[PDB]
Subunit: 252 residues, 5 copies
């Protein structure tokens, strides 16, 4: 019945949460995998998530189908788009909740781009996916990324706050949003999200491992549930060491 | 069978009606919530509606799902769009009548933008929602907001009158429209709406509490069923006192 | 089985037909109602149609649902658009044949705009509606109004003729088209309609009552089944009187 | 099972075929009916087809529904557009295979415009119609008319050849294409069509009847199954004479 | 259950694979068939595939339906577009997995154009097709061709790599991508494809047969499963002899 609660049981048993994000292959393509070549291998990602004690991984259906082994809770990211694309931002489902269920997913993921000239297309589709999520008792995790239209600065405190509120209004049981850069403004985003837990979208690799930790601590001060981190772990050679330190910070 | 009657029974037992609108989170975003921070909390809105003696609240499905507790009749607002959006005005359903039913809604809401380059998209979708509203015996409340195309002044008396008529034509069992600024032109809108009750869309916060009371006054003079108010209540620090003021005005009782 | 015959039996028992059109509330808005304020009231329209001895009324579903009382045969106009709209002409269904049936309609109506950039959109939807009309045994009345694309003069004899032929080709059991201004060219439109009866679209209120009556005689001379009249009746203060004059002319 | 064979059995019992095309009322409008006024009457067209010994007629659903009497095999042309239209060429179905079946059709017809900015819309819809044609055991006749995009000269030999091949690729059981003007290049179009029989699209009424009869002779020797002729028969005052001379030539 | 394995069993019994591609009739049209006229005949293609000992053929549904005889495993290419088309690249299904099954296909094929302004349209459709492929136990082969948007050089190593990764992400069980021109960059594409086998898209006729075989060599060094070759076999007057050479090289 309560899907936020189901999400928390599964992805935040310790009261905070670290998700290893891995939809990069479609969203950005494989170029970033070159810094740490093993990252192109989804098997490595599963081992990495498990060895670091993380709460979950995010796979596109193709990766889930060919590689998922049940060893770490899965969020199946249902839509995806490429950076090669030049239109108004849009990302459509390449899979379904029902198929995610049969692949052993514990939750489903969907990106919206509020403000886009295609914002309606994603809301329309989200309606079906939200309905399916409830039907299959799978928490819906919304990546809420305002982009297009009037959006100029994506990390502006008013834009991140709008992102968080939109996700709540649309039925998200958990959400993933960009960091504002400082914990005071980010906590307003966290507040307007209400009962719905907020994960920080990790983003591009930071100059040092130190800068990222400082961000993560900011996020926690603000009251977020934790982080959904991709590049900033698996793009690094010392992925597991750095992952473990992310664990110590977030969990203890 | 008669859904306007069902709406009136539920949302206007006293013969007039106040609805506490709260779809703002999606439509405008959370910035407005800063003036009175508790307004960001839907639990506060439910208490506020109940404590003021209001007839209902309007929630988007997400808020309804996570917060609705059955303590005040609910209109589930089915579609929503953002102000970040720049195209021809369009607002698509993010939920369904069937789901609204299971969330305890007593009515459903839907916005149309007559005149928009996308007007057909909303009419197309309203056809399905209207059919579902009848099927689930849930009154359909239409927010009728002419915008785009030839519309320049939204509160023009001819535009508000068109808005009211369009809602009636398309099957609204109750409607919500912008005020013209004066009761004589607004009553023409109310007249062309015929059997379908008209609620005034509250709008942006007025310089003073009494500016808004004067508007409501005129709205009642015109023969409207009442008001769907959002900001002008919950953006104020003294939301209950002022809500209670509106309640004295609208339910009168002389 | 034969829907044109069903239409004639219901809407033309006297061998000719007058329909009181009342979809104007959506199409043009309520400004026209100001000349004769009672016309804003659909109850007045029903009384007017009945007292004049007319054959039917045309309502949008909202008006049918709230006001229709079975006292005059109903054509439920399925689609509608506004004059506030600025794009390529398009009008989509806001209701269905199945619902019209349950509201006591005796026929359904649908506008197409041949030549529009959106002509395909209406043809696509007409396919579904025509199929439904046959299924529910409800005659389909097609308002055939070439507009957009290459159309410059809507009352041009070649354009009205095309309009009439398109309606026949697409499955209309009865049609409504604009008058050419003279009975010679209008009778070519009537001729290309073949077995499908043609009603004249009444149009904007004429300078004098006699101007209109003379158009109606032209229409009848050309072999049309009659008129679908709106404003030219209900926009006048003497609606019933003038309606009764129209009845004497058309029914004989 | 084999629909090309069923087509040949019904529309080419003599081993060649003449189809009397009559979708012109929607495609071009009724202006061409003026040269020979009876041609506006579908009843005349059925008599004409039968009296000339032709194999079939092509009707839009409206004309089929109101006029078809089972006296000559029918190809129900499913889609139609107008010349008033100005956008990228598109023609959508205004009817269905299932309804065609119930109207006594022996085959169904569908136009595609390869190259059009809307080419995808027609291929999408063709998929459904092809599936339906197989399901109802009704041969699919594809009018293949490259238009829009890069197409400048429609009767260019490479364009007509492309048109033929596309029809074969998409599932046509018989096809209708424009003549190149000479039997050498037209027989390459016929060759790339493979097992799928090719009918020449008749086109605008030729200056002189011999001008048409020659096209016919070149089409036949190029190895086409025959002709789908409209205006070049029914626009003529000597309609039945020419049709009977067209027959003697096609059937040998 | 495992569709990649089913694909390998059927199309790569020898551990490597040669597919004879023949969707060109729609994609490019019949002009290329002129160099070796027998190539226009699908019967010749089947004979050619079989006599060369190849693993399969790719047909569009129309060709499969009229010509497929079960003599060589079939991949039914579900979507197709023309070169006459000028818009943002898009190719929609003209057929279905269910129909492919009944035509004796052993796999289904679908093209995506990542980067296109219409990329979402194909991802949307791929979702349905992928689901159908799993349901009917037919391996999905994805032609992954970045085009439109930001794509300028299609054979750029980063673009081909992205192509490969997207195919994996979306659920491809085997994929077909363009060669980079050198085996070092092509093997990065092969690596990011992970468990999903990669076939080289053959492409346009090479200046010399030698140039083609050295590209094939490259492809094999890079660790690809083999080649999907069309024009480079069947456009050659000595098709069979050269095909029998391609065999020798690929299978050892």
């Amino acid at each position: 019945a309560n899907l936020t609660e189901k999400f928390l049981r599964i992805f935040a048993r310790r009261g905070k949460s670290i998700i290893l994000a891995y939809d990069h292959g479609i969203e950005h393509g494989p170029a970033d995998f070159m810094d740490n070549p093993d990252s192109a291998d989804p098997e490595y990602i599963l081992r990495l998530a498990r060895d670091a004690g993380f709460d979950g991984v995010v796979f596109q259906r193709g990766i889930a189908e060919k590689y998922y082994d049940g060893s770490v809770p899965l969020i199946l990211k249902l839509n995806g788009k490429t950076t090669l694309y030049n239109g108004e931002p849009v990302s459509v489902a390449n899979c379904s909740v029902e198929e995610a269920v049969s692949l052993g997913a514990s939750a489903v993921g969907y990106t919206i781009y509020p403000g886009s000239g295609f914002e309606w297309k994603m809301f329309e589709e989200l309606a079906r996916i939200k309905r399916d999520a409830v039907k299959f008792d799978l928490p819906l995790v919304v990546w809420s990324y305002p982009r297009g239209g009037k959006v100029v600065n994506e990390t502006a405190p008013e834009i991140v706050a709008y992102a968080a509120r939109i996700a709540l209004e649309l039925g998200a049981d958990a959400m993933k949003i960009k960091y504002t850069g400082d914990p005071k403004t980010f906590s307003w985003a966290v507040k307007v999200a209400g009962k719905v837990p907020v994960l920080m979208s990790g983003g591009p690799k930071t100059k040092t491992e130190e800068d990222f930790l400082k961000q993560v601590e900011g996020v926690l001060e603000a009251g977020a549930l934790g982080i959904a981190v991709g590049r900033n772990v698996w793009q690094r050679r010392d992925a597991l060491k750095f992952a473990r330190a992310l664990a110590e910070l977030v969990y203890g």
